[PDB]
Amino acid sequence: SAIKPDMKIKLRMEGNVNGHHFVIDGDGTGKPFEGKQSMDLEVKEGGPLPFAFDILTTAFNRVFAKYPDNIQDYFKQSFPKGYSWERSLTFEDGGICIARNDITMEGDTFYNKVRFYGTNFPANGPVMQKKTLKWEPSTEKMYVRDGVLTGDVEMALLLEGNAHYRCDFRTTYKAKEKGVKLPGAHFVDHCIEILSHDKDYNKVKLYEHAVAHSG
């Protein structure tokens, strides 16, 4: 197969961080078998955003991961019907986010319906003060917990002033079709970068590379 070597990506995100409402559109392309995707984002409502764009970026699809023969590829096996994921982001100073994405496919295009909710960021903290620089590359640990494919990673935002701001991610992943078989435990190495932006991060180009491995 359903998945082509070059696929298009359409996205809308709605959400709310610390009471601030926003709507963000994405248009992108990627190479599912190479583990590569990029996306052009445009803030449609609520700009300029009063918080660090970086908290959002991992919400803007593990289909775009290079999987070896010897690990079951749950994501590419979910198409054409698709899959959903739910994520919690627990930051070290008490900020919490819940994000979800329902992913479908029509022809050569993935469609993404994303919701992003955050609360409890301190007003003087690096998120609300816009002090973040980038996510460090990391490794997602994939396993099965009570029948549900689960990915954990301890993430780190580099801040100005050479300190890191830590976040624990937990994602659950669910195929829409009954009986897509679950994989065994494995790892996914990943890196996400902002390639370019304008002044207030109303237009942003994003890139991710991800590779599955067994350790």
Numbering used by the authors: 2 to 61, 65 to 219
From the paper:
The mGeos series of rsFP’s display similar switching behavior to Dronpa. We present high resolution room temperature SFX structures of Skylan-NS in both ‘on’ and meta-stable ‘off’ state collected using two different XFELs, the SPring-8 Angstrom Compact free electron Laser (SACLA), Japan and the Linear Coherent Light Source (LCLS), USA.
The higher resolution datasets, both collected for the off-state after saturating green illumination and were readily phased by molecular replacement with 10.02 and 9.27 sigma solutions. The two off-state datasets go to higher resolution, but mainly due to the higher photon energy and short detector distances used during these beam times. Similarly, both off-state structures were seen to have trans chromophore conformations with full occupancy, giving no indication for the presence of on-state with cis conformation in conventional and omit difference maps. Considering that optical measurements also showed negligible bleaching with full conversion, the off-state crystal structures are found to represent the pure photoisomerisation product and not a mixture of photo products. Photoisomerisation is clearly seen in a comparison of the “on” and “off” refined structures where the dihedral angle of the chain connecting the phenol ring to the rest of the chromophore (N–C=C–C) changes from 1° (cis) → 171.1° (trans) in the on- vs the off-state and the pheonolic oxygen is displaced by 6.2 Å. In this off-state the chromophore phenol ring has been repositioned to include an indirect hydrogen bonding via an ordered water to the carboxylate of glutamate-144. The Arg-66 side chain also displays a translation/extension motion where the direct hydrogen bonding between the guanidinium group and the oxygen of the chromophores’ imidazolic base can been disrupted and Arg-66 has been pulled “below” the chromophore by it binding to Glu-144 and the newly displaced His-194, resulting in a total movement of 2.6 Å towards His-194.
